[PDB]
Design a binder for these strands. Structure first.
Ligand SMILES: [Mg+2]
Ligand SMILES: [Mg+2]
Ligand SMILES: [Mg+2]
Ligand SMILES: [Mg+2]
Ligand SMILES: [Mg+2]
Ligand SMILES: [Mg+2]
Ligand SMILES: [Mg+2]
Ligand SMILES: [Mg+2]
Ligand SMILES: [Mg+2]
Ligand SMILES: [Mg+2]
Lengths: 202, 159, 293, 176
RNA sequence: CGGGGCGGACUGUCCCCAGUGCGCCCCGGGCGGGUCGCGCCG
RNA sequence: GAGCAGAAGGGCAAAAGCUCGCUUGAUCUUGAUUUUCAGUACGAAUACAGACCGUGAAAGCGGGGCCUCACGAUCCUUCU
RNA sequence: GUCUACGGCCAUACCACCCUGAACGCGCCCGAUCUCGUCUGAUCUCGGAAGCUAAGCAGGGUCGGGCCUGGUUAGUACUUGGAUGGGAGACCGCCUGGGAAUACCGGGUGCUGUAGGCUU
């Protein structure tokens, strides 16, 4: 019922999102993009591991769902159901068409959704305890088999999912350049009202 | 295939710039367009009357006729194989003075008054403009400081 | 924490401000464009406009023509300079509007050297009069009236200055419809009750109304008419002397006063060092007060 | 004493328009009679209000004649106030005051005070909505050089209530 | 890296408190640019 | 972030939107020009110029609709 | 040092809040006889001058928001022209020239024309 992924592997069709022009699009296979302990604050999960994809191709929505399940089964089995947070950093926005059965009026109707990646772009993200690095690489290594192209595993120097480096994360939090809320942190520039400096720092 | 409407493809061409909508500034109205001076055709979209065609936007011509609210412009249009001088009536909203001509005029009067002073004193001076000559051998001081040694950074994968 | 903010950060990022004099509510740029723009096939010819601005205390009349760098005033008249001859109290009224319009006309043509020609109407009737150019002599000065944001209803003071200027000899196009004489129903210009407004007779019959009926409410209304005894009588006469005094000398002279010190009445903008210092000792003060505990 | 008696003349809380209103869900003779009560009560011919949407739920279409209202200013608004307030016995209890400094209330019957019952005229009720201001609030309605009034020249709900107690010895905020 | 004397302005160490800029000249150190610059060296 | 008759796009705030008042420039004419273009026509449109008008206090604005579409030769017929 | 009337550029000018304002002026302000408009002299029109800077307005402040201007981002992204360069492809590197935009970090926050007033 679905064509092989080799028929839509390449980004050659001028991004075609679901809009008022492209209606009647079936729902994408992947609806959940965050798994594990999505509530762990910032500190228990300082280790962030990424799956970057070094090919300009498009990954389908069913492949994104399949790799997410594959990474969830392993991370739960090994690190524990509460020992990790997963974030699929790819959304299947592009819509692929199919010309069902000659060439007259060949413009196809939507059939599925894919996500287009670049040479440097993370597909999946896992934050967890520091001692789970080997388990994170293995979980990503297995989920990589569910994608058409070639991907790399990279242990990011940044603290968890936060955009700030792990070595300096603790000391700016200490001097309150960052405050923790939710899964990430809030940068606090020293250029706002002074009353907001004094409700902090006190 | 595509239509032949007089404003097809002018979605952005005649659109106003960001935070530049509304009342047309009046200094554009007291500019004085003589006969035979060079003007750029822009085609602002706030004023719909007397606007040029999309093939004259961003093109430069010379005024040949001055009217109550518009001028006649002789502007070259390149049809397929030949260029012919078109005459178009365009309201003064959609034009402005070309300072390519203004820059040439200020130079000429500079040369003319330099020509006079060169003769009065009796010396000789250069008048034309030369195309950026080579670079006039010079010395470069180190000031007792060793030039900094550079070296390509090792590759590290960031993102 | 209940309602979405309208004036948020994105609101100001794309808020486009109006023209400064539109924001201040002083200039109608829709009317100004039709009023000051010259025909393109004139190339230098000024479009003179008679600016009439009636204020709480004053009346301002000037002739202007618009250039790129800003309007140029060729001559201006003020109602606060009327007391230098004749009428001294009773400004910013219709009789004052006519006088400053007449004064503005007289001092302009005198400055142009054509005062002896285009005498206008030395005798004052509140009727239709339009000056005409004299062949062999320079033509009449033609200008248009700029009412501004004022609502131009019948009997507006902005038209009192028009009558004064056109009685002085300025060729201002107009119609007698917006004059106090005009009657809306029968569409007639009485032109005699108009001349009553010009000589301030409507106010004159107001004062004589009050004296017989009241005293304290009369001096509350016309307090400064009592000083120097501006009675309802001789009020037509004092406007006649004012009109003749304008014809005799409309020239304006100012006064030299440079024996003034260089005192600054504002406070200069604080510098970056002061601003950085001020937040600095605000930091320490908060920390010291916190540590006092 | 002297520290407070500096701004009093031009910060005084003054009653602007009363803007009395009557709304009836239909038109015709009954609405026409409801209009007549305004001339009885204000000596001032009111204006009629039209509905702009056809809802048909309770039943009204667009551009009908639905409500009549008038705005009263000056001393006439002053005595219509204490007329309505003495009907209420000086009791606006908790929250009739808006955050913009004006307040309103409704009376169910008009024949009690003022104008005597006329069997020909009906039994209409109405609601008063007094708006307060200070000298200078008119610059917002001006044509030339319009502007806002400034933060500390506005009227808050609390200072509106203080004015009502200080002027009519009213009772506000029962402990409920 | 700054020293003396005069007019404002800030701080929750405010009678004994502290800190910032600009105003006048008198100086102190270092840096650069022109000077018959003046010499010496190649 | 409304509305401007309609498709969409552009434009517009003491506007071009809404409500009133008065009106018929949606009138009579000659050429020029732009647009598709072969630089032919039709259609549409832009600057004028000459009358006769409308509106406004006036500057001005208006010979249809805020702009981009909304339409038609020879021969014949009908009317002026 | 300012302010009025008319402006040019149209946020370095706007928005929010706080402080200060001598003199002219600008306003608030008082009234409805006339002119003129309203349901309402609230707006508009007119006639005034008891009071007041309360507000408008002006100047200043805010580790203010915006806006303007720099640095970084970054010789990065992208790109003109070249190769019998690589790679199965996707794409990528080099040669020859051009070369950005966020986040982040600084600085600033109306300039000016005409005419006319005030300021020992
Ligand atoms: Mg197969
Ligand atoms: Mg394709
Ligand atoms: Mg096409
Ligand atoms: Mg098309
Ligand atoms: Mg048109
Ligand atoms: Mg107007
Ligand atoms: Mg006319
Ligand atoms: Mg004509
Ligand atoms: Mg800021
Ligand atoms: Mg390159």
């Amino acid at each position: 019922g679905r064509r092989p992924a080799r028929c839509y592997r390449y980004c050659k069709n001028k991004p075609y999102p679901k809009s008022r022009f492209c209606r009647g699009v079936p729902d994408a296979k992947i609806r959940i993009f965050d798994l594990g302990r999505k509530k762990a604050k910032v500190d228990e999960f300082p280790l962030g591991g990424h799956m970057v994809s070094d090919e300009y191709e498009q990954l389908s929505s069913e492949a994104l769902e399949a790799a997410r399940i594959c990474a969830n089964k392993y991370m739960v089995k090994s690190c524990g159901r509460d020992g990790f947070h997963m974030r699929v950093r790819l959304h299947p926005f592009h819509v692929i068409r199919i010309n069902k059965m000659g060439m007259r009026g060949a413009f196809g109707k939507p059939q599925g959704t894919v996500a287009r990646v670049h040479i440097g772009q993370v597909i999946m993200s896992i934050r967890t305890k520091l001692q789970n690095e080997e388990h994170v690489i293995e979980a990503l290594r297995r989920a990589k088999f569910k994608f058409p192209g070639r991907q790399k595993i990279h242990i990011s120097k940044k603290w968890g999912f936060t955009k700030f480096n792990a070595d300096e994360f603790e000391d700016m939090v200490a001097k309150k350049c960052l405050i923790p809320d939710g899964c990430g942190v809030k940068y606090v520039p020293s250029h706002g009202p002074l009353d907001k400096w004094r409700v902090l720092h006190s | 295939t595509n239509t032949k409407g007089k404003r097809r493809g002018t979605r952005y061409m005649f659109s106003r710039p960001f935070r530049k909508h509304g009342v047309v500034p009046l200094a554009t109205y007291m500019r004085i367009y003589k006969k035979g001076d060079i003007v750029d055709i822009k085609g602002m979209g706030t004023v719909q009357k007397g606007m040029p065609h999309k093939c004259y936007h961003g093109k430069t011509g010379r005024v040949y006729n001055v009217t109550q609210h518009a001028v006649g412009i002789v502007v070259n249009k390149q049809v397929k194989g030949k260029i012919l001088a078109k005459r178009i009536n365009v309201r003064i909203e959609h034009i402005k003075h070309s300072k390519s001509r203004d820059s040439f005029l200020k130079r000429v009067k500079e040369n003319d008054q330099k020509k006079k002073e060169a003769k009065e004193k009796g010396t000789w001076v250069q008048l034309k403009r030369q195309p950026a000559p080579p670079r006039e051998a010079h010395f470069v001081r180190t000031n007792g400081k060793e030039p900094e040694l550079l070296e390509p950074i090792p590759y590290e994968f960031m993102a | 924490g209940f309602v979405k903010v309208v004036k948020n950060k994105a609101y100001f990022k794309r808020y486009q401000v109006k023209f400064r004099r539109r924001r201040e509510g002083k200039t109608d740029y829709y009317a100004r464009k039709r009023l000051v723009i010259q025909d393109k096939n004139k190339y230098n010819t000024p479009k003179y406009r008679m600016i009439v601005r009636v204020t709480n205390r004053d009346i301002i009349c000037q002739i202007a023509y618009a250039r790129i760098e800003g309007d140029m005033i060729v001559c201006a008249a003020y109602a606060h300079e009327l007391p230098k001859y004749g009428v001294k109290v009773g400004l910013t009224n219709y009789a004052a509007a006519y006088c400053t319009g007449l004064l503005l006309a007289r001092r302009l043509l005198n400055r142009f050297g054509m005062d002896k020609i285009y005498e206008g109407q030395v005798e004052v009737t509140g009727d239709e009069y339009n000056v005409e150019s004299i062949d062999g002599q320079p033509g009449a000065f033609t200008c248009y009236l700029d009412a501004g944001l004022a609502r131009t209803t019948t009997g507006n003071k902005v038209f009192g200055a028009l009558k004064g200027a056109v009685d002085g000899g300025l060729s201002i196009p107009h119609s007698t419809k917006r004059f106090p004489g005009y009657d809306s129903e029968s569409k007639e210009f009485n032109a005699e009750v108009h001349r009553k407004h010009i000589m301030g007779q409507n106010v004159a019959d107001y004062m004589r109304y009050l004296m017989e009926e009241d005293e304290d409410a009369y001096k509350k209304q016309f307090s400064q008419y009592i000083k120097n005894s501006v009675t309802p009588d001789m009020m037509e006469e004092m406007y006649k002397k004012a009109h003749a005094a304008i014809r005799e000398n409309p020239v304006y002279e100012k006064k030299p006063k440079k024996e003034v010190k260089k005192k600054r009445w504002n406070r200069p903008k604080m510098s970056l060092a002061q601003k950085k210092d001020r937040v600095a000792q605000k930091k320490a003060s908060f920390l010291r007060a916190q540590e006092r505990a | 004493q002297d520290q407070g008696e500096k701004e009093n003349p031009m910060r005084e809380l003054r009653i602007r328009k009363l803007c009395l209103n009557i709304c009836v869900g239909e038109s015709g003779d009954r609405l026409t009679r409801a209009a007549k009560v305004l001339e009885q009560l204000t000596g001032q011919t009111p204006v009629f209000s039209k509905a702009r949407y056809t809802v048909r739920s309770f039943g009204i279409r667009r551009n009908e004649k639905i409500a009549v209202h008038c705005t009263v200013r000056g001393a006439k608004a002053e005595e219509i106030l204490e007329k309505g307030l003495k009907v209420r016995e000086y009791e606006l209890r908790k929250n009739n005051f808006s955050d913009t400094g004006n307040f309103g209330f409704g009376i169910q019957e008009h024949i009690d005070l003022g104008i005597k019952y006329d069997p020909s005229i009906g039994i209409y009720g109405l609601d008063f909505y007094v708006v307060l201001g200070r000298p200078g609030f008119s610059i917002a309605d001006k044509k030339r050089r319009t502007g806002c009034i400034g933060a500390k020249h506005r009227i808050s709900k609390e200072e509106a209530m203080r004015w009502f107690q200080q002027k009519y010895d009213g009772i506000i905020l029962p402990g409920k």
